[PDB]
Amino acid sequence: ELDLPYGSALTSSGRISAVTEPGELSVHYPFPTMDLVVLDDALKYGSRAAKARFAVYIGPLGADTAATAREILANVPTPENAVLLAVSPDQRAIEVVYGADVKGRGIESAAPLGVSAAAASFKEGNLIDGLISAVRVMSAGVSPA
Amino acid sequence: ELEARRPFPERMGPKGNLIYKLITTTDHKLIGIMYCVVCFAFFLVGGLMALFMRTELAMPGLQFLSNEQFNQLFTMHGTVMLLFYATPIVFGFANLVLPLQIGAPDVAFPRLNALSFWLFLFGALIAIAGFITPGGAADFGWTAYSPLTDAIHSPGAGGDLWIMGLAVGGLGTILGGVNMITTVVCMRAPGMTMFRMPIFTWNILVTSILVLIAFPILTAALFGLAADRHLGAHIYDPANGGVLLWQHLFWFFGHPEVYIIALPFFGIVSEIFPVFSRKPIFGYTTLIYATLAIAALSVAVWAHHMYATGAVLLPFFSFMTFLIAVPTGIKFFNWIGTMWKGQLTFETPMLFSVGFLITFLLGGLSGVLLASPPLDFHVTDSYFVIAHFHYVLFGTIVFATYAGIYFWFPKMTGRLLDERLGKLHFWLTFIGFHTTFLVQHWLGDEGMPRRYADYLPTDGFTTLNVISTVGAFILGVSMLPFVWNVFKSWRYGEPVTVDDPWGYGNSLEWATSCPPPRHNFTELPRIRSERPAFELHYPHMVERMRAEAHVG
Amino acid sequence: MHIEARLFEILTAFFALAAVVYAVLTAMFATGGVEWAGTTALVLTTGLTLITGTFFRFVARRLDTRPEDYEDAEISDGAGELGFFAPHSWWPILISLSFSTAAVGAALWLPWLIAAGVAFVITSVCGLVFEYYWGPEKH
Amino acid sequence: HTGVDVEDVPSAEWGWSHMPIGVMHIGGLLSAAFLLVMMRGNHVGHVEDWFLIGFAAVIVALVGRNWWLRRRGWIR
Amino acid sequence: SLNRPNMVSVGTIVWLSSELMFFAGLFAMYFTARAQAGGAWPPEPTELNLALAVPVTLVLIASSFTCQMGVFAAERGDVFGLRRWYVITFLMGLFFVLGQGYEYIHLVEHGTTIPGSAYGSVFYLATGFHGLHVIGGLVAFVLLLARTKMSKFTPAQATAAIVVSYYWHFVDIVWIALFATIYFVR
Amino acid sequence: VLGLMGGLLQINPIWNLGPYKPSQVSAGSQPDFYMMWTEGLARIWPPWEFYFWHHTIPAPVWVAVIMGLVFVLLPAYPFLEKRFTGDYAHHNLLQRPRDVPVRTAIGAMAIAFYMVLTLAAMNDIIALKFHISLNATTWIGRIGMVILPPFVYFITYRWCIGLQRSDRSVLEHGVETGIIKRLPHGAYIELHQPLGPVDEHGHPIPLQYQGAPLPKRMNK
Amino acid sequence: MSTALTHGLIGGVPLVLFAVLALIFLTRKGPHPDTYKMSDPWTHAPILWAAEEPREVVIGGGASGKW
Ligand code: HEA
Ligand code: HEA
Ligand SMILES: [Cu+2]
């Protein structure tokens, strides 16, 4: 009873079957591919060496920023053992949230470091680049447990 | 509600993910990929042989080759290009997209599939491994005429390997055909009757019937030839009717072969046209009947290859080839009608299909010109014939195969091939091809027969050979963009996170996830026509599809 | 199945017509009489299509309607349990290797290689046929 | 053990599963040098040295590609 | 679901048709080179002993009925009748091929050879391939019996038995054709 | 078995030969198959000699040192492996060759080297029966001696890891039975069979690997 | 016909044609969206990227900073 914007159709299962016109894409990420790849292996190999999902958020936080960040953290598959990094380029605000299960592993000694590195890299206009730096430092900080 | 994703899908895959799955596999998708890759390797080998031939044929005089080496070159070129690249690519496309199109989880016999693939590969490797013999590979023609392939003439050890490799490959092809017929007949979705399945599937069924009719007789002829070579079996002596017997048997095999490698690509292009024309396929049942007619007629024209022997009944075969010329015409007109008054967009598959149309029309015109005996009395065994069958072969296999690759790459990978590289590739191929093979009509009309390694400067036709070799080198350079595009776009390249990346699709394969799961389906739609995915993605269109389906 | 049988009957009719016409047109008007090499191929391709069509016809007459042959039907009709489709197996590549050994032993006239190839083909085919029927080991 | 990760090699704590990469790189270079020097004492022919140089060039190209891709972080 | 028309049956039928085309090629080889040799086209050193060609044909024809009785006992779920009938069929097929080998020996003894004549070539090449098909059928019989021995009897075994049975029927009738062409028409 | 094959097959018919005389020779001069590698190494080693003051170092010296190096590297392997891996504990349970990819690859490389050396010893027989040039076989051996071992190493490593992954897949899920169903909303599943306990919704709980082989066919 | 110029054409025409066709086609714009530059506002939909690595709502800490 939703809109299904001109091509989507709900199947006999819950799956949606979307389409695309011959001359467009289906991602629309305003970043180059060769930086998406770098952010991806950062996010994967740093999560291997720390036993904790690392996430990244870029949308707006038009409220109490920490409230909204911990509202968002409930969307990671295992939020209790996860580390999220939120960024709002309009409000120019950085927010790092933890989980209850990931703590006592050297996290708060590393969150301000990551925030400072992300800010120092953002002050020139490098979004993906600062995200990479912050993920690197926080993943190198947290210990496996 | 937000929903977690990845910045970019994974590029390659874990270590040890493929090599053992490659040996024990039984799913048709991996086997189709293997088919395609090895067939393109063999295509590259054959093309290299052709480039050697061209660079010798320019500049009168034997610069770096010999007569023996030239004969081996054109023999192996013809053999590889016809039997180790086209006949298996047919089954490659079949194994790729037939079970998806009929809505089945697998092929009928899943281990016979792998058996067929491995038989093909090892037979090809056996037949090619005659070049490491000090005497060389087979040196007779591709056709292996009657007393020249005896034991007295052609005594080397390359002809034996030739014969045995062909036998093994033929066994593999017969098994593949059996599997395809059984799959199309038995395993089918619970809603679709046989007059709702796509045209590609019908062409594959008919081609499999032709394979079953044609290949066993070739195996019989080859066993007779091997008996004659290794036991002195007096089967093909000219003292008996041994010279014309071989020709009758071989051509009864060999014309159904060209129609076998022609029909499924007609299917491919007929399946690509409506997606980019935004229209239904014009004359469904008409196309089915034309396919059946071509199939029935293809076995009773075998002797239009033996006009110059003076030993056949000319009016019969001449008239019946004139007859087989018609259904191809109705097929062509149905394609043009499907493109008529639509909304055309020229992405790479549509571009390659239009190129196919043009090239095949010219080739078929030259062929129907060739079909009259008093004209074949002059142009046979010349370069006119070479230009003709190169037009038809190229325009069909090469162009329709590139179209099929650019069309079904996402449905098998989840990525998208680049389009600028695709356009560059198409234009290079088109220009080089039409510049390498056009002057050969004139080159062969004036006396220059096929299979000559040298000629004299006092003769004419020394500039036309230079133009042809320039074109051949352009065609050779035209393959770098394609392999670069495939090498880059398989790992990187814009991912596909939806069904049907070419909107307005049909055929029930664009109704499942872009890389299909194992067993190909998580749910099926209700089937009412031959465009089920189109009616699934645009439910507000069935009233208009049923209302105005008969204006014309 | 009703349409497959009709297809094969059409093909058999045309092939028989062509065979008879060719035979009687080369009995006269030809250099040496009946041609004897295309005639045979034509009668026996007629026989091929005839065998297949007759089998399909019998199976169709001995069968009730099927969700595939039937229009008007829905996906809840075919709900059930299909046959047995073999998962992973490695015997095909060994069969192909054995057959290739026998073939290369027949190309170069080497009888010992032909014997070895035939033995390997028998062994590999036995392995393929018995793969899903060997019981647990007896200890 | 010296160390690899279990998602790469599932049985990493049951047996030796890692060999350093410098061994493989320098071994490839040494084998290429052996192929190149194997054409000393040219015995009346040059069909063989074409093959020698081709195989050596292919080996060097593979080693160079691997080294360059590892140096830029495209592999691990 | 299971779409009652069996799958193995369709596969075996289409493959049998292809093999018929193979034998078509062999027949076409034989008929040419018979229109060439004029007069006594079987050369003088050959004489086809009919006193031994008929018994083997009759034992093959009887083996057909034996195989049919076997598949009859198979379609109802009892294996021992199948085993008995198929052992009988195997025995008499072996006897047929042994008699054929004996005729080959006595024919080459004082006459035709493959490199000696054209008739000898076409004769040996038309009958030896049929002999090879018979030997393949015997191997199939042995394999099927072992498979029935090694596990429980289910419908799949019945399907295997049926398809082997009518493959053997095919080889039998094609032999009937070969024999009627070679020995009686001449 | 030994009696049968000593009665039915002929070996070393010395009477077809003659007594030894330093002036006559024949064409097949091979030793038994356990010295063929020594002969092949002597055949495919290039002619590198050194001539300095009043002396000469011929080519077969190379064969001598290579032979000695092989015979010295064979008995000293366990100490090399324990020095390189650094594992000095007692062991009474064996390893499956698929759990130790590096050692399996080393062994496969050594076996490939041995096979190349052994086939390079029957040059004459191979080039005569299979129609190949003799110089071609010499160069094929001389190049294979360098490019076949590493290729075999690479393939064996990847193959071992593939086998490990195939084991982990049947540990996580159950044994594939090969039966297909259609699931009235047109879905195809394949009816796995669990090896242990099951959870609330029918999926089996994954097991842990214990170094023992796992069944792959339902009839076993 | 003047062996030098035959070799010259055969070696030069294909590569020249490749050059013109590449400069014609490979210098256009792809369908990829052009990079986002932080001087200007952010209009794209919200983005959430997970790690996916370890297979299978009480907060433990936090931090902040505003550039
Ligand atoms: C893959 C394909 C392929 C195809 C499709 C064809 C198609 C045809 N071929 Fe060709 N042919 C070969 C491959 C192919 N051929 C090969 C490989 C050889 C020789 C090889 C060898 O000898 O070594 C060969 C040789 C060959 C010969 C003998 C050459 C000889 O002298 O040696 C002849 C004529 O007898 C012939 C005829 C035809 C005809 C009549 C068609 C017809 O199918 C085509 C009809 C097509 C049309 C496009 C008509 C278009 C229709 C309309 C537009 C309506 C127009 C109506 C009128 C003009 C009436 N072919
Ligand atoms: C399906 C088939 C097919 C295809 C695609 C081709 C492709 C080509 N053919 Fe071929 N040809 C035949 C089928 C085919 N041919 C047949 C049947 C005959 C006659 C048979 C005979 O007489 O017996 C024949 C004969 C034939 C001749 C004349 C032989 C004779 O003298 O009579 C010539 C050249 O004039 C020729 C040219 C070409 C050219 C230039 C291509 C170009 O299309 C190919 C361009 C290809 C490439 C250059 C490959 C690219 C290669 C490189 C990139 C090298 C890279 C190398 C490695 C990586 C290994 N063909
Ligand atoms: Cu001709």
Author numbering:
A (entry chain J): 13 to 157
B (entry chain F): 10 to 561
C (entry chain H): 1 to 139
D (entry chain D): 25 to 100
E (entry chain G): 18 to 203
F (entry chain N): 276 to 495
G (entry chain I): 1 to 56, 69 to 79
Which statements did the authors publish about this structure?
In OXPHOS, the protein complexes of the electron transport chain (ETC) establish a proton motive force (PMF) across a biomembrane that drives the synthesis of adenosine triphosphate (ATP) by ATP synthase. The reliance on the PMF and ATP homeostasis thus highlights the importance of the mycobacterial proton-pumping cytochrome bcc-aa3 supercomplex, which consists of a bcc menaquinol reductase (complex III, CIII) and an aa3 oxidase (complex IV, CIV) that are tightly associated. M. tuberculosis cytochrome bcc forms a dimeric assembly with endogenous menaquinone/menaquinol bound at the quinone/quinol-binding pockets. MK/MKH2 are part of the Q-cycle hypothesis and essential for electron transfer in the cytochrome bcc complex.
TB47, also currently being evaluated in preclinical studies, has been suggested to target the QcrB of cytochromes bcc from M. tuberculosis and M. ulcerans. The 2.93 Å cryo-EM map shows density for TB47 and confirms that it binds in the same location as Q203. Three hydrogen bond interactions are observed involving the side chains of QcrBThr313, QcrBGlu314, and QcrAHis375. QcrBTyr161, QcrBLeu171, QcrBGly175, QcrBAla179, QcrBLeu180, QcrBThr184, QcrBMet187, QcrBLeu194, QcrBSer304, QcrBGly305, and QcrBMet342 also contribute to TB47 binding, largely through hydrophobic interactions. Unlike when Q203 binds, there is no interaction between QcrBTyr164 and TB47. There is no density linking TB47 and QcrBTyr164. However, after addition of TB47, the values of turnover number for the hybrid supercomplex reduced to 5.1 ± 2.9 e-s–1 (mean ± SD, n = 4), a similar value that was observed when Q203 binds. A mutation in TB47-resistant M. smegmatis (M. tuberculosis: H195Y) is close to the Qp-binding site. The binding of TB47 to M. tuberculosis cytochrome bcc also induces very similar conformational changes in the Qp-binding pocket to those seen for Q203 (rmsd of 0.454 Å for all Ca atoms). Differences in binding are due to the different ethyl group and methyl moieties in the head groups of Q203 and TB47. When analyzing the superimposed structures, it is apparent that Q203 and TB47 act competitively with the quinol binding as they almost completely occupy the Qp pocket.
